[PDB]
């Protein structure tokens, strides 16, 4: 129902966090952005200065809103649906630990869900779908979205 009038987007990174490197945290993004745009004609494009569509940073506990984490667990990251400038932007808990082995809450597993959100696509009850409501460790080796994913962002977007 809640899709993007155009097929062009752009994003910002507002920081890297210091629990990987800059290298590593920009290459998380761009694998979200391929394992989308490759069923999607959607467009994204980086932005070096100004304001993006999507910005993505990471705070803290408090974070100016009536929204608090509840700490290391829990809220692993949020976003606001398809809106004009403050809508599509992301933010993450940088008192959790985002690695991109196999340990605490992988951050390309809450990357390409948030993602999902953002394209208008809602919960899914797949365990093998990123839009599963439980965070889950997968094999980014060879990972793609299902069928179920599939039949549903093309149904948004075609
Ligand atoms: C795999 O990607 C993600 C991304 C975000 C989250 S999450 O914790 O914010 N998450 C799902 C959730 C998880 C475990 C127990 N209860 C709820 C949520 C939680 C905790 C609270 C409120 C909203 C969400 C949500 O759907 N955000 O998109 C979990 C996994
Ligand atoms: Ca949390
Ligand atoms: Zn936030
Ligand atoms: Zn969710």
Do not use: C
């Amino acid at each position: 129902t809640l899709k993007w009038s155009k097929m062009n987007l752009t994003y910002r990174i507002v920081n890297y966090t210091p629990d990987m490197t800059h290298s590593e945290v920009e290459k998380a993004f761009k694998k979200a952005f391929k394992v989308w745009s490759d069923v999607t004609p959607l467009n994204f494009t980086r932005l070096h200065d100004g304001i993006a569509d999507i910005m993505i940073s990471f705070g803290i506990k408090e974070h100016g809103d009536f929204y608090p984490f509840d700490g290391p667990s829990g809220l692993l990251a949020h976003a606001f649906p398809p809106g004009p400038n403050y809508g599509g932007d992301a933010h993450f808990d940088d008192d959790e630990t985002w690695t991109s082995s196999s340990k605490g809450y992988n951050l390309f597993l809450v990357a390409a869900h948030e993602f999902g959100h953002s394209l208008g696509l809602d919960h899914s009850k797949d365990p093998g779908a990123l839009m599963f409501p439980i965070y889950t460790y997968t094999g980014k080796s060879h990972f793609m979205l299902p069928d179920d994913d599939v039949q549903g962002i093309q149904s948004l977007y075609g």
